[PDB]
Design an enzyme around this catalytic site. Sequence first.
Site, mmCIF file in Angstrom:
data_model
loop_
_atom_site.group_PDB
_atom_site.id
_atom_site.type_symbol
_atom_site.label_atom_id
_atom_site.label_comp_id
_atom_site.label_asym_id
_atom_site.label_seq_id
_atom_site.Cartn_x
_atom_site.Cartn_y
_atom_site.Cartn_z
ATOM 1 N N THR A 53 0.810 -1.218 0.000
ATOM 2 C CA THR A 53 0.000 0.000 0.000
ATOM 3 C C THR A 53 0.847 1.274 0.000
ATOM 4 O O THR A 53 0.286 2.369 -0.111
ATOM 5 C CB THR A 53 -0.977 0.010 1.194
ATOM 6 O OG1 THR A 53 -0.330 0.528 2.363
ATOM 7 C CG2 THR A 53 -1.498 -1.393 1.491
ATOM 8 N N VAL A 89 5.747 0.607 -4.910
ATOM 9 C CA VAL A 89 6.191 -0.600 -5.580
ATOM 10 C C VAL A 89 7.424 -1.129 -4.868
ATOM 11 O O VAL A 89 8.266 -0.357 -4.395
ATOM 12 C CB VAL A 89 6.462 -0.312 -7.063
ATOM 13 C CG1 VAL A 89 6.833 -1.588 -7.789
ATOM 14 C CG2 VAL A 89 5.225 0.334 -7.689
ATOM 15 N N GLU A 110 17.086 -5.420 3.273
ATOM 16 C CA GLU A 110 17.541 -6.779 3.039
ATOM 17 C C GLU A 110 16.449 -7.548 2.306
ATOM 18 O O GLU A 110 15.259 -7.235 2.411
ATOM 19 C CB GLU A 110 17.890 -7.468 4.356
ATOM 20 C CG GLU A 110 16.692 -7.811 5.226
ATOM 21 C CD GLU A 110 17.062 -8.695 6.421
ATOM 22 O OE1 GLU A 110 17.562 -9.826 6.212
ATOM 23 O OE2 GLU A 110 16.858 -8.252 7.574
ATOM 24 N N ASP A 155 0.347 -3.317 12.637
ATOM 25 C CA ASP A 155 -0.193 -3.953 11.442
ATOM 26 C C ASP A 155 0.469 -5.307 11.239
ATOM 27 O O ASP A 155 1.015 -5.604 10.174
ATOM 28 C CB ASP A 155 -0.024 -3.071 10.208
ATOM 29 C CG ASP A 155 -0.961 -3.480 9.078
ATOM 30 O OD1 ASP A 155 -1.936 -4.242 9.338
ATOM 31 O OD2 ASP A 155 -0.729 -3.051 7.928
ATOM 32 N N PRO A 186 -0.285 -11.284 7.981
ATOM 33 C CA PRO A 186 0.669 -12.181 7.308
ATOM 34 C C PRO A 186 1.366 -11.544 6.123
ATOM 35 O O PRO A 186 2.553 -11.812 5.901
ATOM 36 C CB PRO A 186 -0.209 -13.365 6.880
ATOM 37 C CG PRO A 186 -1.365 -13.311 7.789
ATOM 38 C CD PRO A 186 -1.632 -11.862 8.003
HETATM 39 C C1 LIG Z 1 8.205 -10.924 -0.075
HETATM 40 O O1 LIG Z 1 8.022 -10.004 -1.150
HETATM 41 C C2 LIG Z 1 7.013 -8.999 -1.022
HETATM 42 C C3 LIG Z 1 6.827 -8.450 -2.441
HETATM 43 C C4 LIG Z 1 5.703 -9.592 -0.455
HETATM 44 O O2 LIG Z 1 5.184 -10.599 -1.292
HETATM 45 C C5 LIG Z 1 4.642 -8.519 -0.208
HETATM 46 O O3 LIG Z 1 3.465 -8.826 -0.447
HETATM 47 C C6 LIG Z 1 5.057 -7.219 0.289
HETATM 48 C C7 LIG Z 1 3.991 -6.227 0.692
HETATM 49 C C8 LIG Z 1 6.399 -6.940 0.375
HETATM 50 N N1 LIG Z 1 6.799 -5.709 0.843
HETATM 51 C C9 LIG Z 1 8.006 -5.134 1.274
HETATM 52 O O4 LIG Z 1 7.911 -3.953 1.610
HETATM 53 C C10 LIG Z 1 9.298 -5.863 1.300
HETATM 54 C C11 LIG Z 1 10.302 -5.550 2.264
HETATM 55 C C12 LIG Z 1 10.181 -4.492 3.342
HETATM 56 C C13 LIG Z 1 11.495 -6.266 2.229
HETATM 57 C C14 LIG Z 1 11.730 -7.267 1.283
HETATM 58 O O5 LIG Z 1 12.901 -7.957 1.260
HETATM 59 C C15 LIG Z 1 10.766 -7.600 0.318
HETATM 60 C C16 LIG Z 1 11.022 -8.681 -0.701
HETATM 61 C C17 LIG Z 1 9.570 -6.877 0.357
HETATM 62 O O6 LIG Z 1 8.611 -7.202 -0.577
HETATM 63 C C18 LIG Z 1 7.488 -7.910 -0.022
#
Ligand SMILES: CO[C@@]1(C)[C@H](O)C(=O)C(C)=C2NC(=O)c3c(C)cc(O)c(C)c3O[C@@H]21
Lengths: 277, 297
Positions: free
Chosen positions: B15, B18, B82, B128, B131
């Site tokens: 939200t 990207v 990370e 928040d 999962p």
């Molecule tokens: C696990 O990957 C994502 C795309 C997951 O599926 C998902 O829905 C959301 C909302 C994600 N948001 C992130 O902000 C974030 C962060 C802090 C760290 C990180 O290393 C990944 C890969 C991240 O991306 C994930």
Amino acid sequence: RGSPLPVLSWANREEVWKIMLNKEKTYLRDQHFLEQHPLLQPKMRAILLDWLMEVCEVYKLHRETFYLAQDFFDRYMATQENVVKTLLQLIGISSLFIAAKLEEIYPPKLHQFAYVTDGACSGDEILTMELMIMKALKWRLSPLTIVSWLNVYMQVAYLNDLHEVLLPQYPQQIFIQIAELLDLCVLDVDCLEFPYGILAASALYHFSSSELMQKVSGYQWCDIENCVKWMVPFAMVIRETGSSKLKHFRGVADEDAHNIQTHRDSLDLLDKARAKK
Amino acid sequence: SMENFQKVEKIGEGTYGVVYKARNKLTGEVVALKKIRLDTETEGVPSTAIREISLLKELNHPNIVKLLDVIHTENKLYLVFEFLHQDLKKFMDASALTGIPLPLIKSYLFQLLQGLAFCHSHRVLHRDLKPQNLLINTEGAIKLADFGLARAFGVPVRTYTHEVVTLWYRAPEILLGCKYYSTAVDIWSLGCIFAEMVTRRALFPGDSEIDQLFRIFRTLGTPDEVVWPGVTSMPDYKPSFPKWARQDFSKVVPPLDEDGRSLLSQMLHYDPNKRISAKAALAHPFFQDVTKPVPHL
Ligand SMILES: CO[C@@]1(C)[C@H](O)C(=O)C(C)=C2NC(=O)c3c(C)cc(O)c(C)c3O[C@@H]21
């Protein structure tokens, strides 16, 4: 220096207290920082912060918001040199913008921060400056402010039989009376010699006793002695003029009003305090 | 800027913006990049981004996503994190056919509580814990992410933002409109997530404020003054509420043993002052010999 906090049910009090002390340690303040700005004089810092207090009252912003803004201003100016006085307003108002977005549920909109500068600072200029400030502070924007220390001390002082230290349980008058002395001290750049928790413990001492100070802060007399002595003429000026009464604010419960930053013209009091020593 | 980093692909869009997968050009390290656009923000840098950045600078813990850097370029802010491989929402929906194995449920809950115990000792509410915001890697560790909704609480607290936490995971005191809330609201969300992992479906899948209330009463019983002193005088409470009755936890969570029904029922205790802390939850017998397995992705 002892742990004054009670048994906490949400975390071990020895660690919570340790994390708080290390915080005060790694956030650095320099009472001499205006020496890097030879065109500036300490009185201009007093004028700027006094004005931020005034703005905070108009918009009903929290005391913590004002002290965040103060800390951001003093810490940012220590990272710069050769700032001209016509820029201080922009730096101050932008520190308050950052602080209000951090701290307030519903902070004033950008156009209000620009509005209170009467045309001196546009919205665009505030957005430029907030990035300058946050980057120069390395995004270290979570200090323990002067007034947060006061809040901890008040909670410990009025700990009842529940020991649930997170629900507010201190009376309003003692809080605003001590805040009012801290609000006068913070206008003197010489206050930065002293860690924030000692400023709050010293101001508390001047409204109570050694026994209460020690009980709620864990400090010994020798740790705060210099600050207490520095503060004496400020305490006296506040005593001489009388402590302000508790204001009422629209949309603010009366039981929460002590949290709202107040303002009175304080520059004559300040010179009066600085004239005595 | 986006000199030192080579984008690889967009991998999602929380939200906030990207999320990109990327590679550090100097080290070859793989990272994730959250893009915060600033030209679409009348208020400059969003308060949620200022909170998230400044809090993650203070919170270095193995079970909290590490913020590596903050890059300001053009009218964008890039948050370098990370890299973890999968969130728990997408991981469960893919494992929902077989459920999530139980030895993993023990580790993931255990680790989420060390992450949370750490936040609460630093006086940070996450607010928040859903999962989608809990990120797992191939090596079996799970970490708290997305501190945009977080807030550092004072001692004492004051009234904070009402309606925090995604509705399915929101603690009942928030829904009843309590003046104050603190650490207990994060524990409640972890209980909801504990039982969602076990039964493979969400524990309280309401679709409104008053509807979410009722899904909780149907399962835990409609509280009263004995179980939760002061509840009938809370502002969002009505006497017209239907009086449900508690369920056996063999019925709410079949795969759970006695220790699991114990710890879980303590996390969902109605009274926030009697609700179990993350510090205490780590000591509960359920984590007697907790394990560390590698997931199937
Ligand atoms: C696990 O990957 C994502 C795309 C997951 O599926 C998902 O829905 C959301 C909302 C994600 N948001 C992130 O902000 C974030 C962060 C802090 C760290 C990180 O290393 C990944 C890969 C991240 O991306 C994930």
